[PDB]
Amino acid sequence: VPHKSSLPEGIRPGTVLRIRGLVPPNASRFHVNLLCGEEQGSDAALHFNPRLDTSEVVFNSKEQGSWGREERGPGVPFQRGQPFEVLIIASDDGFKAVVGDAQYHHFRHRLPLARVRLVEVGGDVQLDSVRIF
Amino acid sequence: PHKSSLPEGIRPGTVLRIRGLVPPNASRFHVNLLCGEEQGSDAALHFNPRLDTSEVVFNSKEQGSWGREERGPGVPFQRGQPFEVLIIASDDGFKAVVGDAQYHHFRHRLPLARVRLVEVGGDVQLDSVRIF
Ligand SMILES: OC[C@H]1O[C@@H](O)[C@H](O)[C@@H](O)[C@H]1O
Numbered sequence: 001v002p003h004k005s006s007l008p009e010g011i012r013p014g015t016v017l018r019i020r021g022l023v024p025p026n027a028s029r030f031h032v033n034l035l036c037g038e039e040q041g042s043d044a045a046l047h048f049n050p051r052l053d054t055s056e057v058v059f060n061s062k063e064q065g066s067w068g069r070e071e072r073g074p075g076v077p078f079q080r081g082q083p084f085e086v087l088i089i090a091s092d093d094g095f096k097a098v099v100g101d102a103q104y105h106h107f108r109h110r111l112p113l114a115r116v117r118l119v120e121v122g123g124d125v126q127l128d129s130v131r132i133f
Numbered sequence: 134p135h136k137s138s139l140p141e142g143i144r145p146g147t148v149l150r151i152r153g154l155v156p157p158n159a160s161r162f163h164v165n166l167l168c169g170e171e172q173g174s175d176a177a178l179h180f181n182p183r184l185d186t187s188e189v190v191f192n193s194k195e196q197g198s199w200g201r202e203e204r205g206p207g208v209p210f211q212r213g214q215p216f217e218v219l220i221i222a223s224d225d226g227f228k229a230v231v232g233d234a235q236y237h238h239f240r241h242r243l244p245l246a247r248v249r250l251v252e253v254g255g256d257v258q259l260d261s262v263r264i265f
């Protein structure tokens with residue numbers, strides 16, 4: 001299910017994205033994108049890409065159709081056949097990624113938080129819910 | 134009377150996650166964000182679910198006196214039931230989330246930078262209190 005949540009007014013420091021779901025057996029990878037528009041090729045303030053097939057999580061941004069330098073977190077905190085809960089929290093200096101009870105990584109802002117207009121979740125994941133507080 | 138200290142306070146983006154159960158014969162419990170360890174210290178936020186009178190009260194305490202009470206819509210808590218609460222600090226206030234929904238937005242009355250301690254007390258069965 002390619003999930004999309006529209007955020008007309010954008011987000012601000014103090015915004016929390018909570019994503020719950022299940023990593024199916026044989027999943028290769030999935031992603032959570034914070035995009036700056038609803039069209040194809042829109043800039044991505046955040047590309048959060050857990051890769052079960054290569055065992056790592058990649059963070060990146062996309063601007064003018066071109067990717068920035070990837071950041072990687074300490075191992076993959078997801079497992080095939082197991083549910084998970086991810087909190088992506090917007091702060092003044094970056095996005096904190098919390099995976100089930102522990103801070104996993106901090107991704108410093110590359111694009112203005114104010115330009116984020118859409119959240120998309122896709123890939124090999126079976127979503128329970130996506131809530132924005 | 135669970136106390137979790139926050140040296141270097143909290144800022145926009147700080148998230149408080151509280152998990153526990155409301156005892157079967159619970160009257161009320163509270164979550165306080167205080168500006169000091171000493172008793173009677175100022176409270177930037179007082180979140181007080183009252184199961185006896187069926188109302189959730191929000192308030193602050195400055196120089197010993199309670200401020201103007203604010204109430205959320207109804208009581209999202211039930212006796213004998215487990216719960217998860219998120220208190221999110223932003224630039225304009227604290228967002229209280231109960232379950233899967235935003236319950237109330239309490240706008241700042243005291244400086245966020247004066248927040249030094251979190252306290253959870255009253256009739257509540259605490260599972261965990263995590264700060265992100
Ligand atoms: O840097 C992030 C990008 O890395 C590429 O290797 C991948 O094909 C893209 O889908 C995206 O994940």
Ligand SMILES: OC[C@H]1O[C@@H](O)[C@H](O)[C@@H](O)[C@H]1O
Nearest residue numbers: 179181190191192199200202
């Ligand atoms: O308004 C907040 C305060 O209200 C009082 O009536 C109560 O005794 C205090 O414990 C606190 O809840």
